[PDB]
RNA sequence: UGUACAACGGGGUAUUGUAAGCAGUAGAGUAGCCUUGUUGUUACGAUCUGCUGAGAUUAAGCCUUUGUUGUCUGAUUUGU
RNA sequence: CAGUCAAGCGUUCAUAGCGACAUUGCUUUUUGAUUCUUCGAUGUCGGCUCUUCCUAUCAUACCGAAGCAGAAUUCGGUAAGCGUUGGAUUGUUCACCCACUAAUAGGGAACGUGAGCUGGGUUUAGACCGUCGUGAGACAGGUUAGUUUUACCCUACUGAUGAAUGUUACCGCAAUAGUAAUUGAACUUAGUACGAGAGGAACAGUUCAUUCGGAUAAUUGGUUUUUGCGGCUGUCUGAUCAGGCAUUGCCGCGAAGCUACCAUCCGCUGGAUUAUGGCUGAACGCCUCUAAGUCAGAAUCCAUGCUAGAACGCGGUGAUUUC
RNA sequence: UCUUAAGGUAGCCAAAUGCCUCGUCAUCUAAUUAGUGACGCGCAUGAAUGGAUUAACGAGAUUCCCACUGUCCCUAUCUAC
RNA sequence: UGAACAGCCUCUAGUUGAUAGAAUAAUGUAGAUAAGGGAAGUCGGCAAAAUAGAUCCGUAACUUCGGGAUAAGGAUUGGCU
């Protein structure tokens, strides 16, 4: 017979299979549609999600119940030390897809990106790119003609960029590498621009702007094998159920005599690639800049790093992106930041945001102070403060 | 939002599901009101309709004045015990959940409101705002 | 914006950190944390809790400033 | 054989809520003695006060270390 | 359940909406008819959970018709994309009220679903009543109590590895498969259009919300074996200190981690079309959206985007073993 | 008036006995095939094939109310095995 | 300790036997806690929770006068002198 009362499907089907991601750095499937007009600029950036923190700002949308009144919002702060361009790959269009016909590398690749090619760096003899850097001699007799070949046959060119993993407070040293599509000039300008930037750095303030509508692409938090009740949110069976209740009861009718693919089943949860779009940048800070933890209203000399440092992460000592709302992936994790794939002329996106205050209090419990200076002021001297 | 309400009520966390009994903050003689539905509610396979601050509900007077007893009557939630977050960031809650009898258009049956009234409820419903002693 | 003062422990309440409590007699109490927000409902005395600001003021402790 | 890594120690951030010890013109008092006080004196006496936001714990998936002490070639397999 | 005709109904009028007398069908969603399958056993009603499918469409998208002034409504088309509830009583399917809602449409999958549950009903043996029986006993009559067994096999499904393609590492492409967003309210338009008045919209804009979904733990709440701190009982270590035991002794607080529409954020825009409305224009010197040609257009379809990446699809690049 | 051996008396009831039947009325509830109180031409109640009450008692059955709670809304966490 | 050959800890005595090691996924079995609501779940409050010892105050209907009754419902509770 029919289902007695209708109900929505438990869980979205567009994300199957809920298997572990291929790699810890979720790929960027799609890029903003290319132009040949605007200046050459990167379409993405690699960062490391340090954590979250609280903000207060004047909501500035007309017709709100809270127009021109304080709103408390959650933001995630992304550590973004300047990436280094180390290579350029050109793509040709084929009736079977885009095919990379050439990658061209720089001269002195960093040791931290050289570690990427190795699994056992400690005992390896570090011969990577030795003969490429040797080939780079005679003012690059092969490299020059190979760039010309890209210019001759390339429809889309992407630069290879890697993060300065050593600048972050992580225990890792094997830098992550990624392909970033270059939007901007025609192919020749892009590769000339990229050639100018070989083994040269790009920071966020040059690629992302305040109030820009960006996407975070990353691998979600993992949770190991997970039962259906949490994996799909299915109803728990009643308490008096024999042989357990954290299940789904009927996995399918007698016919078809097969468990249908669309039936909730227990297994891996998390660690999937997820793209979260339309996030708002609130502040593209500068690591060199002290007091980036303050605003035009607060005027304190505290940095963005919360007291006691971010939990599990450390401190922010580089440029950062302070973006409203959650992002996929947990702390320490590589995240990919990507420009929006369409013009977002919604009023909510065009809001001209300016912050008022930034929470520096400790994330490691219920800390009540914004800076050790203020904390000292409240409590006075201590038996330790001699 | 109720029909006589002045439009948009931001989402207060629902803490008074169907079957909850709240105090009667007005002076119509009802002692408590027992929720039988919530106006504007949704639909799900086993989800109860729930009430929040400022929601217009349909309630029954389980205890109190005889002629108010034993019939359905619309009510308006003025106090909630389930803490909820405002836009401005604060988590706040009353220690009593209570409402006031009102007709569907949104004019209170009672004359005055006892105790505080939630700011969202007062802002949403003008009549409760007029009769409210202290609004928070 | 403004920072509140906890109604029980006297700690500074920054935007959103803590809860707000409206008693039946319409007296509002802002708590910096569940610690204050729970010691209050237990009917403990702020003047008797050793780390409370009222206790510190009453016993004059640290008042040598 | 190092902006190396680790085990400890240091600092921060945190959690609880004022350690032990000592001292008191603190203490319902009760027994004992006298020089009968106005801090008399001995024994017992919960609890209070001062040292004392003290003491304890703090990554085990917290942050940072100018300190101490170490550790750093064992196996197997792979060819167009 | 759907048509065919059209006596009459409907102010006038058969066909806006109906539809008698008759009449032609369709479905297996009822009950029957048969006994072909199973009686060396296919677990048998309902509910609970969950997935998918049909369309004879309740709502939503776009439309055509009216005894459509507006408002509300009714009939109909493309349409199953998307949703179709909370409760009282009953084992109930069904039914009947209460209420919310946009709506509370009908159905299938061995009357889906018992090695998924429950065992309320039915359906062993106890027992009671009524009626029928002389009696033993009978009763889809009522009532009460009544063991609901096994998966480690194959497959299916969900997740997880994996030999070889010279080796190994990195960066990629993308065939194919999946797909998601949903609906309402308020302010304004506007007390405007419309109407004599009663009444009373809609297009755009804005702020929100419902259902669903993917993340995250800055904030709040929950959890506490941090057995972290504090406290308390009984006992034990001669007393003190410090502790043991009380299956985690208990209580207060309790970071981290996990987690909650109980917390927060986010959930994309182009084409081609259906219905339909149109154009040009013959067939049929006229006329006609139609035949040739063609324009706009739906919650439709295909893309954009998202997910996995063929482990027998593939690309670019690095380094490739001497004593 | 026909018939029997005599025609269900006192009581009780849609009761564990009432098919129609979810009987009718009242109460309980927002809503009640449930519960209770009445009504009784009662298919098919009824007097030691015992009738009607009945304080107390009941691991009997049933309904409602207060308290209580993860039974549920709506799931989350922790420990041991 | 306590009313107690209840429960918990100890003395004499006796054992330290039950295949172990490493991790801490899902589902379980056993033991808990959950904000707001409080049976809306469900055949049905099934399971759980709440109350609980003692002293004092108060105690209804009905009744076979014996009961109901610990009715219901409140207050107090250590240590030390």
Swiss-Prot record, chain B:
Methylated by RKM1 at 2 different sites, but it is unclear which are the 2 methylated residues among Lys-39, Lys-105 and/or Lys-109. One of its GO terms (biological process) is cytoplasmic translation. It comes from the Eukaryota. The modification N6,N6-dimethyllysine is found at residues 105, 109. PROSITE patterns: RIBOSOMAL_L14. HAMAP family: Ribosomal_uL14 (MF_01367). Belongs to the universal ribosomal protein uL14 family. Component of the large ribosomal subunit (LSU). Mature yeast ribosomes consist of a small (40S) and a large (60S) subunit. The 40S small subunit contains 1 molecule of ribosomal RNA (18S rRNA) and 33 different proteins (encoded by 57 genes). The large 60S subunit contains 3 rRNA molecules (25S, 5.8S and 5S rRNA) and 46 different proteins (encoded by 81 genes). There are 2 genes for uL14 in yeast. This is Large ribosomal subunit protein uL14A. It comes from Saccharomyces cerevisiae (strain ATCC 204508 / S288c).
